[PDB]
Design a binder for this molecule. Structure first.
Ligand SMILES: CCNc1cc2oc(-c3ccc(F)cc3)c(C(=O)NC)c2cc1-c1ccc(OC)c(C(=O)NC2(c3ncc(F)cn3)CC2)c1
Length: 543
């Protein structure tokens, strides 16, 4: 069947949109930035709709059946509970999109009578009706990118706030338990960046002759079939559950997850979906389990020797025993053919790598830096151009949600985070006098809140003390930040190093947590190094 059907009505915005920042004609830097940086808007929504609309074909085999049976068996050992109406209301984030029924996240969170009783009828309706399609809204995401053409806008498909609370009642406990239970160590979302690196280093070292590859499915959400979604439901039903959860899970699968009509921001019918909805509670878990099932089966079909797998939604990495370059190349082609048969076709074909550092997954790669005594430290990095471009977007566009503080947290050991992002961020917090204030930031389709003064403790907990002493960066990391700065029209590293010395001194002068930030985060900026010791604060819980 077709992944989507369309009526011709536009995917409409709800906010003012901007494809490009206005150019300053007397600035060459403004010109370089204008030539390279763009924001996705509703205007490209139709181009995305064309790319994601296609017929799916699925051919399953004994390799697929065998893997599916094993994950159902592991799922059968899990016991999960219903969340009460109150717990599910409490799990709603402060600014979750308001309901069409005249109530927002504030009424849900505070348990206001009308919001609670509206959700109660949505819940009872799921128990008595297993068939009526649930309506959804389709919206074009506004994301900043750097060219090399332009990526069209990604689409978000989500049900009403009242339905979102009900999904949590039925499946929240499952999302917190099922992935780790059925995938074990392969479950990608259980690791901090230092633990992920440790996992990859152990996977690499345990092979006699390692080979690794990453796989990208072309438009994964659209490749998910109705049969794939009903299979996810049978995985969920393999768990031990209250009968009320079983009924609600079945109704959610048939009325929402398998498909349904999509409406734009104006209430006009946009189309009909017959694939994965991007904005449902089960998107991340469903994608991770389904990608894992299809990939493990494809590994068996291709004759991949001793695979160690790491799965993050549709992002997958397989580290295995190399059979030599010719056989590895034949095996990756057979893996791709099996993946395509299972309806998970490739975007870019996979390539075997014989150095862990050469694999790109979740836009990232492992890099090596030397410590002050010459010890090799391994950490995750990425090309810094798009994160730096996103950081710059907000200097002319003061957004209430920062789209680059997530980079400081995830990529804290990197040259580009330490020298540029940290320097710029702490500078702007001191100019605005917002240092000690909690701020909102986006991280993998979620709006988190963090206090900037807690950054040294958060970083040590997620990366270790090593994040504050990556002394000698690789030639590639050095070239990557220098080219990114040049391409965006930004000042070079020598300027950032001078600015960091002033930022370090200004933070130290404020004392307390601001002085800890200055001493730990900017030790790279001084020749007379302080001896950085473990933070007792890092021995606290962020998760
Ligand atoms: C570093 C850039 N990000 C990432 C870099 C990555 O590089 C590879 C990777 C690269 C090369 C390889 F050869 C193999 C693999 C990844 C992979 O697994 N591909 C299969 C991968 C995933 C993320 C990622 C995604 C979502 C997250 O979050 C959902 C997080 C996170 O770390 N979130 C945080 C947290 N999560 C869990 C936890 F317990 C503590 N902290 C801190 C807030 C990270």
């Amino acid at each position: 069947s077709m992944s989507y059907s369309w009526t011709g009505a536009l995917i409409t915005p709800c906010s003012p949109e901007e494809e490009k920042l206005p150019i300053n004609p007397l600035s060459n830097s403004s010109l370089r930035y204008h030539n390279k940086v763009y924001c996705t808007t509703s205007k490209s929504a139709s181009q995305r709709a064309k790319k994601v609309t296609f017929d799916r074909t699925q051919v399953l085999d004994a390799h697929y059946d065998s893997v599916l049976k094993d994950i159902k068996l592991a799922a059968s050992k899990v016991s999960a509970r219903l969340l009460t109406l109150e717990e599910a209301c409490q799990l709603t984030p402060p600014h979750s999109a308001r309901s069409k029924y005249g109530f927002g996240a504030k009424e849900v969170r505070s348990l206001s009578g009308r919001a609670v009783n509206h959700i109660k009828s949505v819940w009872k309706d799921l128990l008595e009706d297993p068939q009526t399609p649930i309506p959804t809204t389709i919206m074009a995401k506004n994301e900043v990118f750097c060219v090399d053409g332009k990526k069209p806008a990604r689409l978000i498909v989500y049900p009403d706030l009242g339905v979102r609370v009900c999904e949590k009642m039925a499946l929240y406990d499952i999302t917190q338990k099922l992935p780790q239970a059925v995938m074990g160590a392969s479950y990608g979302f259980q690791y901090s960046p230092a633990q992920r690196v440790e996992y990859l280093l152990k996977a690499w070292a345990e092979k006699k002759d390692p080979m690794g590859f990453s796989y990208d499915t072309r438009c994964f959400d659209s490749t998910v079939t109705e049969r794939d979604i009903r299979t996810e439901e049978s995985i969920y039903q393999a768990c031990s559950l209250p009968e009320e959860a079983r009924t609600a899970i079945h109704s959610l699968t048939e009325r929402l997850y398998v498909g349904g009509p999509m409406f734009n921001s104006k209430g006009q019918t946009c189309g009909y979906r017959r694939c994965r909805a991007s904005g449902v509670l089960t998107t991340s878990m469903g994608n991770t389990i389904t990608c894992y099932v299809k990939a493990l089966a494809a590994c068996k079909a291709a004759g991949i020797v001793a695979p160690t797998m790491l799965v993050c939604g549709d992002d997958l990495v397989v580290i295995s025993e190399s059979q030599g370059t010719e056989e590895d190349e034949r095996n990756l082609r057979a893996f791709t053919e099996a993946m395509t048969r299972y309806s998970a076709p490739p975007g870019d074909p996979p390539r075997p790598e014989y150095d862990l550092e050469l694999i790109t997954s979740c836009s990232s790669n492992v890099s090596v830096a030397l410590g002050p005594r010459g010890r090799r430290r391994y950490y995750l990095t990425r090309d810094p151009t798009t994160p730096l471009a996103r950081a710059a977007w907000e200097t002319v566009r003061h957004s209430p949600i920062n789209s680059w503080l997530g980079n400081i947290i995830q990529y804290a050991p990197t040259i580009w985070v330490r020298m540029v992002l940290m320097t710029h961020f702490f500078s702007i917090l001191m100019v605005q006098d917002t240092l000690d204030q909690n701020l909102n930031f986006e991280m993998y389709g979620s709006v988190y809140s963090v206090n900037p003064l807690d950054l040294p403790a958060i970083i040590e907990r997620l990366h270790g003390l090593d994040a504050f002493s990556m002394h000698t960066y690789s030639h590639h990391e050095l070239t990557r930040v220098a080219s990114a700065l040049r391409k965006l029209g930004a000042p070079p590293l020598r300027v950032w190093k001078s600015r960091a010395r002033a930022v370090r001194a200004s933070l130290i002068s404020r004392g307390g947590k601001a002085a800890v930030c200055g001493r730990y985060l900017f030790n790279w900026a001084v020749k007379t190094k302080l001896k950085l010791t473990p933070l007792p604060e890092a021995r606290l819980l962020d998760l």
